[PDB]
Each structure stands twice: as C-alpha cells, then as structure tokens.
C-alpha cells in the first residue's frame, strides 16, 4: 500500500518543480532511468550550477549520469539506504522511490528546520505550532494525524483565516475535507495535487515520506507570505526614523534662523550709547529696556536653551541609530549660534547702568538750567534798575550841603551793590557747571552769563566814576 501513495506524490512533486524545468514525467520508474530528468530536477529545486548530463543513448552513458547526480548528493552528505546507481537505470521501483525521498528531504525539509533538529522534528514542530489554537486538530506523527485531513484546512486558516470557513469543518467527513483542502492549495497557493484523498482515508497508515512531501510544499508557500512581515517592519522602522530625524532637522534650521534674526535686530539697539537731549527721552529709553528684560528677553532665553535641547536630542537619536552626525548650515552652526548670543549679552549689561548714569546727569542739568534762568532774570532786573539811577547825572546842579547829602546816598548804592556780589558769583558758578556737564544750550547760557558779567564790570566802574565826581564837587567848595 505504501508504493501506491509514494508513486502519486513523488511524481506530482517532481512535476511541480519539473513544470518550470520544461519537462514532465508520467512513469517515475521509467523516465528517471536515463538520469536526464533527475539531474534537471536537482538543478531547479537547488537553483545551483550542476555538471553536464551525457545524453544516455548508450548503456554506459546512463549509469555515468546517475553517478554524477549521486556524486552531487555527496556535497550535501546525505546517507544512502539500500540504494544502487545501476538499479536506477535498471528501473528498480522500491529503489527509485526511496531515492526521490532523499532528494525531497534534503532540499525541501532540512533547510526548513531552524530549531537545529534534523528533518521530521523541525517540520513537525512547525505543524504543531501552527495548529495549536485548533481543538479538533491533533498532529503528532506524519501519518494517522494527517489521515483525517482536518488539520490541513486549519493550516490554510492559520495564514489565511479570511479564505477558509473553519467553523463548518468537522471529523464526520474526512474525505471531503481533504479534497477541499487540496483544491484550495492547487487553485490559489499553486501546490499541485500529489496525495489522493480516497486512497489515504481507506488505508490505516499512510506513508510518512509522501505526506511529509506535501506538507513541505505548504510550508514553503507560506514562507514568503510571512517573510513580507520582516520586510514591512524594517521599512516602517527606517522610514519612521528617517522621517522623524528629517522633521527634527528642519525644525533646527527653522528655530536657529528665527533666533538668529531676533538677535540681529536687537544687537544694534543695545549697543547705541548715544545719549538724548532731555531726561524725559532717556527715562523713556529705560522703560523700553525694562520691557525688553521683562517681556522680550525671557522667551528668547527659553528659545535659546530650547534650540540647545533640540540639537542635543537630535545628535543622540542619530548616534544611537548609527546614522551620521547632523551638519547644520554655515550660519546656523553651534559655534555661530552661541557666538551671536555672546555678542548680544555684552551690550545689555552696560546699557542698564549707562542709561541711569545719563538720566541722573540730565536730571541735574534740567534743574541747574532752570535755576540759572531764574537767578539770571532776578539779577537782570536788579542790574537794570541800578544802571538807570546812575545814568541820571542830575548832580552837577548842587551846593556843598546837597553834595554831602548826595555822597551818603551814593555810599548806600555802593554797599547794596556789594551785597549782590555773591549773587553774580552764584550765577557764574552754576553756568560753569552747565558748561562742564555739556548742557545742550551751554552756548547760550555762556552768552547770558558773559553779558551779565561784562555789564557788572561796567556797573562797578561807573559806580566808582560817579563817586569821584561827587568827591570832586565836595573838595571844590571846601577851598
């Protein structure tokens, strides 16, 4: 019974890989005799370069090629079990079928096992792992567990649950469930029908080599469907990483230029140490500098050390992901950003103090200029008053009695004049300070003070000139 199941399975498995090769077999014990179909089957399932098969018309040529294909099997190393190279050309049915299983096992069962367990253990473990949530399925051996054929339909739900109605299937119809599972595999997964359902379910124990061959083709088909996950998770990994790192790189250039530009416009304002003419104007400058330090520099301080934390995390994300270091623009560099922020801070410390020291010096000038204006006017009137009483030369018409009386009246005009000496000295002193403190109108305060001083000299000499006239009259009548 084992030979009926091996013949159908190993023929349609050979046909599944020989359809590609451009040839087909009908009698596995006759077509493989020359060794041409066997050497071609090894070239396809391995995808490797193989020696050249002689045509095999002669009797010695056929054996020479069977030995070439069996010498290729010595690169794999697989053990030989009751097999002869001559009896392949002879047409030994039990020998050829057993040798085909050697080829199916090495190329479609050993490269399958990744859990270091040789041949059946690696394939059984996969069948048990994929059929674990199924309750009606029981896979322990490659014969009685496969005989029901309900677990093969579960394998197609394990990778394609949308394609099969698992719920409908039961153990009451093993034949129809096996038939349905092989039709789905042939029409969609491209796995040609190698096991006949009617033959397996009748027999008490089916051949393990034939069943394992059919399962290996199912595993191989779902290897690329599950390999799509490895390809998707890695592309999602590098794309999400490169998209986030590129977004964060663009925000550094954006934030660096926005900060770089605000520093560019607030640096000239901060280094303008040219004072104004009035204390009102400089006190105004102090309030806009007060607004700068209270409502303009604090957020730009946060955006400077925000640019630092953003650049810091950017270089770490690139270092921990093996990506190269981020290189900013020529002007938006690390040293260029800290360099511009360094230029800004020097200008702002002087600006405070300076502004006050200008405000105070103006405060004094504003006061002393008004005080001078007040003292100059009260003296200008007093000096005009005393100037006119001296211009009245009505003394020439007088007798010694009137002259001596007029001399004591002029004596008072001398002592009261001397009282206004320190008043003129104070005018000169507070105009001298406005000149020393660089008052804007110190050119016109010096004129008003010079004219007052030049007139005070003439007032004094004219005072002594009139005494000498009265004295010339008193010592005239005397003799």
């Amino acid at each position: 019974a084992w030979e009926k199941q091996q013949r159908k399975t190993f023929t349609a498995w050979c046909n599944s890989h020989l359809r590609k090769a451009g040839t087909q077999i009908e009698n596995i014990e006759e077509d493989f005799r020359n060794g041409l179909k066997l050497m071609l089957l090894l070239e396809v399932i391995s995808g490797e370069r193989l020696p050249k098969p002689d045509r095999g018309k002669m009797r010695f040529h056929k054996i020479a090629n069977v030995n070439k294909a069996l010498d290729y099997i010595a690169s794999k190393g697989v053990k030989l079990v009751s097999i002869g190279a001559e009896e392949i050309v002879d047409g030994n049915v039990k020998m050829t079928l057993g040798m085909i299983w050697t080829i199916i096992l090495r190329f479609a069962i050993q490269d399958i096992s990744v859990e270091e367990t040789s041949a059946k253990e690696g394939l059984l473990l996969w069948c048990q792992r994929k059929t674990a949530p199924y309750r009606n399925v029981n896979i322990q051996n490659f014969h009685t567990s496969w005989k029901d054929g309900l677990g093969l339909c579960a394998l197609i739900h394990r990778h394609r649950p949308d394609l099969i109605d698992y719920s409908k299937l039961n153990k009451d119809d093993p034949i129809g469930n096996i038939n349905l599972a092989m039709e789905i595999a042939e029409k969609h997964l491209d796995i040609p029908k190698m096991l006949d359902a009617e033959d397996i379910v009748n027999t008490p124990k089916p051949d393990e080599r034939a069943i394992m061959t059919y399962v290996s083709c199912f595993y191989h088909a779902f290897a690329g469907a599950e390999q799509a996950e490895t390809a998707a998770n890695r592309i999602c990994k590098v794309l999400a990483v490169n998209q986030e790192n590129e977004r964060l790189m663009e925000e550094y250039e954006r934030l660096a230029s926005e900060l770089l530009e605000w520093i560019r416009r607030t640096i000239p304002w901060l280094e303008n140490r040219t004072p104004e003419k009035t204390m009102q104007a400089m006190q105004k400058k102090l309030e806009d500098f007060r607004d700068y330090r209270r409502k303009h520099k604090p957020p730009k301080v946060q955006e400077k050390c925000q640019l630092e934390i953003n650049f810091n995390t950017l270089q770490t994300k690139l270092r921990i992901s093996n990506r190269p270091a981020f290189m900013p623009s020529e002007g938006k560099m690390v040293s260029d950003i800290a360099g511009a922020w360094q230029r800004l801070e020097q200008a702002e410390k002087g600006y405070e103090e300076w502004l006050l020291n200008e405000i105070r010096r103006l405060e004094r000038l504003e006061h002393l200029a008004e005080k001078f204006r007040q003292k100059a006017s009260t003296h200008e009137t007093w000096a005009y008053g005393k100037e006119q009483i001296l211009l009245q030369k009505d003394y020439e018409s007088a007798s010694l009695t009137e002259v001596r009386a007029l001399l004591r009246k002029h004596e008072a005009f001398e002592s009261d004049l001397a009282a206004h000496q320190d008043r003129v000295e104070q005018i000169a002193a507070i105009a001298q300070e406005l000149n020393e403190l660089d008052y804007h109108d110190a050119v016109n305060v010096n004129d008003r003070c010079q004219k007052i001083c030049d007139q005070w000299d003439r007032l004094g000499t004219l005072t002594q000139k009139r005494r000498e006239a009265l004295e010339r009259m008193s010592e005239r009548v005397r003799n």
């Binding site: 490895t230 890695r234 999602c236 604090p298 995390t313 921990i320 093996n322 020291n357």
Partner: protein, 382 residues
C-alpha cells in the same frame, strides 16, 4: 536859633539811613533765598534744609523788633516837622529806601515763610516715601539673590552624583524645577518694586549690594541651567535604554562602580579594572588591559567614560545591509525594485516616499523604471 531844633531832624534822618539800608538788603536777600530752588537725594539733605529754615524762623521776632525800631525813627521825623511846622520835602536825603518800601517787603518775607516750610515738608514726605521703596527692594533682593545661588549649587551638585540612579535624579530635578516655578512669583513682584524706584528717579540703595540686573542675569542663568541639566538626564536615559541595558542592571553597574572607587573624584582604575575582570570571566587580561589603556581616551581612565567603555564592547545594532537585504526579498531577489512592487506590499503612505526618493538602477541587469534600493538605503545611513 532854629539850627538847634532842626539839627535833631538831621541826626534822626541819618540814624534812619544807617539802620534801614542794611535791613533792606537783608530782606532783599531773604526774599530771593527763601524761594530758592532745591534738589535733595538723601533724608539728611532735606533734614538740613528744614533745620536751616527753622533757624531763620527763630530770628523773625527780633527782625520785627528792628522793623518797628526803624519805623519809630521815621514816625518821629514826621512828628517833629508837624510839631514845629518847618516846610520841607519830607523825603530822607540820605536813604532812597522809603518806609513804605520796607513795610511791603516785610509783608512779602512774611508770606514766603509758610510757603517754604510747606515745600520742604512736601520734599521730606517724598524722601521718606522714597526710603521705603529703597528698603522694600533690599528686603527682597537680599533674599531672592542668595536663594538663586543655592538652587544653582543644588542643581550643580545633583548633576555630579556618585550614587547615580537617573530615575531618582529626574524626580529630584523635577522638584528643583518646581521650586523655581513657584519662586518666579516673587521675582516678578521685585521687578515691580524696581520700576517704582527707577520711576521715582532713585539711584541710591546702600541697604543692598545686589542690583536688579544681578538678579535678572542670575535668574536667566538658573533657568537655563535647570533646562540644560534636565535634558542631560533625559539624554543619559535615552542612550542607556537604546544601549539595551535594564534600569535595575544600570543601578547595579553604578553600585559596582561606586565600591571599586578609592579615588572618588576619578574612577579607581589600573589594577582596580583588573579587579573587575577577575570578578567575571577568565584570564585574557594582558591584551584586554593593553587595549583598555589605549581606549582611555582617543584624544586629549575616566569615571563616566569607564561605564561607557564597559558597555561599548557589547555591541549589537541595525544597519543598511539589513534593510538592503529586506528590500531585495521585497523585489523577489532582484537587484532593483519596481514602483508597482513598493505599493503592492508596503502601506500606501510609506510606499510613495520610496517611489519618489529612490534613484535609477542602471546596473548590470538593467530594465526601464527600475529603482536602485542599494543607493537609497546606503544613503539613509550616510
């Protein structure tokens, strides 16, 4: 004859002129200096001006006595010229300053005295209110100023901890940051007092050594220091988690590091690193010691650097050869990939970034529309 009766008039007129003339320029000098302009920037400067004005107010009864004594002579002159009916101009030939003139000028001095003390009391009130502002500023600046210095030191100490836990350091730094956010409430109130002082034209504060700019700089320094050091903790955790080592294992390494530390300032090294190698593994200390002496520093063994060099030999990462092989299995083992293939498997969003940024294949097995994933992926990694 009448030369004796008339001589008394002349001796009275000259006593008037000799008393009225000096008193007149005293009043002329008092009328001007009483309404004089003043500017003071100290409580002593207003206290001296108010004292000098009280001294002037004190001699006013004596000045009124001389005012009546001078008008007594003037009245007695008009009395004897009326009493003896001698025709004359009745205008003192020695003093040009009439008695009415001295009377109206005295009334003016009398009216300026209440004005001068009310203006001096106004400036005393200004000076007293200004001194309160001076003290208010010194009360906060001398408390806020040193507070900032302490949080600066606390943060500088928390960023040099030997018993490093990282998660404990982050929770400690998040509470130092929380102290700063609840102290700003006091600095913005100090800014208001500074504004009240500078708007009162006050550059005078002996009660404090700290200027507002000293606090403004110190606060910005503290604010940029907490933000800097918090990022340092987040960076150390992000690089530790990426390195693969666990949180408890990291603390275990920090603990093993701490005991093999006799130097303390620096990492206890030389035969102490040999004492770390003897704890785990076997021999291999002649070529590994010589390699660690070369791996002390690539350019001009460190404490934090020692931790990094122990975790450096254990290296496992994902690079370009991993994704070029993953793009080849996508193209079903082709040295190129089609636009149709990229959107057939990949999510439509992530598929379009490849079809745009991937270059021309132009390889040995060339075909029109073939994208080169070997040059796309190898560019993503530098």
């Amino acid at each position: 004859g009448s030369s004796k009766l008339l001589e008394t008039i002349d001796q009275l007129h000259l006593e008037f002129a000799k008393r009225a003339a000096p008193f007149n320029n005293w009043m002329e000098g008092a009328m001007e200096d009483l309404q004089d302009m003043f500017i003071v920037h100290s409580i002593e400067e207003i206290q001296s001006l108010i004292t000098a004005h009280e001294q002037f107010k004190a001699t006013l009864p004596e000045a009124d006595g001389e005012r009546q004594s001078i008008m007594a002579i003037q009245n007695e002159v008009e009395k004897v010229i009326q009493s003896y009916n001698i025709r004359i101009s009745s205008s003192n030939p020695y003093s040009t300053v009439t008695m009415d003139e001295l009377r109206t000028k005295w009334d003016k001095v009398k009216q300026l005295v209440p004005i001068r003390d009310q203006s001096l009391q106004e400036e005393l009130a200004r000076q007293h209110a200004n001194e309160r502002l001076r003290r208010q500023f010194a009360a906060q600046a001398n408390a806020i100023g040193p507070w900032i210095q302490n949080k600066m030191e606390e943060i500088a100490r928390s960023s040099i901890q030997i018993t490093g836990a990282l998660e404990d350091q982050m929770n400690q730094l998040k509470q130092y940051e929380h102290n700063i956010i609840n102290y700003k409430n006091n600095i913005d109130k100090l800014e208001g007092d500074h504004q009240l002082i500078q708007e009162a034209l006050v550059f005078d504060n002996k009660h404090t050594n700290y200027t507002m700019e000293h606090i403004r700089v110190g606060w910005e320094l503290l604010l940029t220091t907490i933000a800097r050091t918090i990022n340092e903790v987040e960076t150390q955790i992000l690089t530790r988690d990426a390195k693969g080592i666990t949180q408890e294992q990291m603390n275990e390494f920090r603990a093993s590091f701490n005991h093999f530390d006799r130097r303390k300032n620096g990492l206890m090294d030389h035969e102490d690193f040999r004492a770390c190698l003897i704890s785990m593994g076997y021999d291999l200390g002649e070529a590994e010691f010589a390699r660690i002496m070369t791996l002390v520093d690539p350019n001009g063994v460190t404490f934090q650097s020692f931790i990094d060099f122990m975790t450096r030999e254990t290296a496992d990462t994902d690079t370009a050869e991993q994704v070029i092989a993953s793009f080849r299995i996508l193209a079903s083992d082709k040295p190129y990939i089609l636009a149709e293939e990229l959107r057939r498997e990949l999510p439509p969003d992530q598929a379009q970034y490849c079809i745009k940024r991937m270059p021309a294949y132009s390889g040995p097995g060339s075909v029109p529309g073939a994208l080169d994933y070997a040059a796309f992926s190898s560019a993503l990694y530098g």
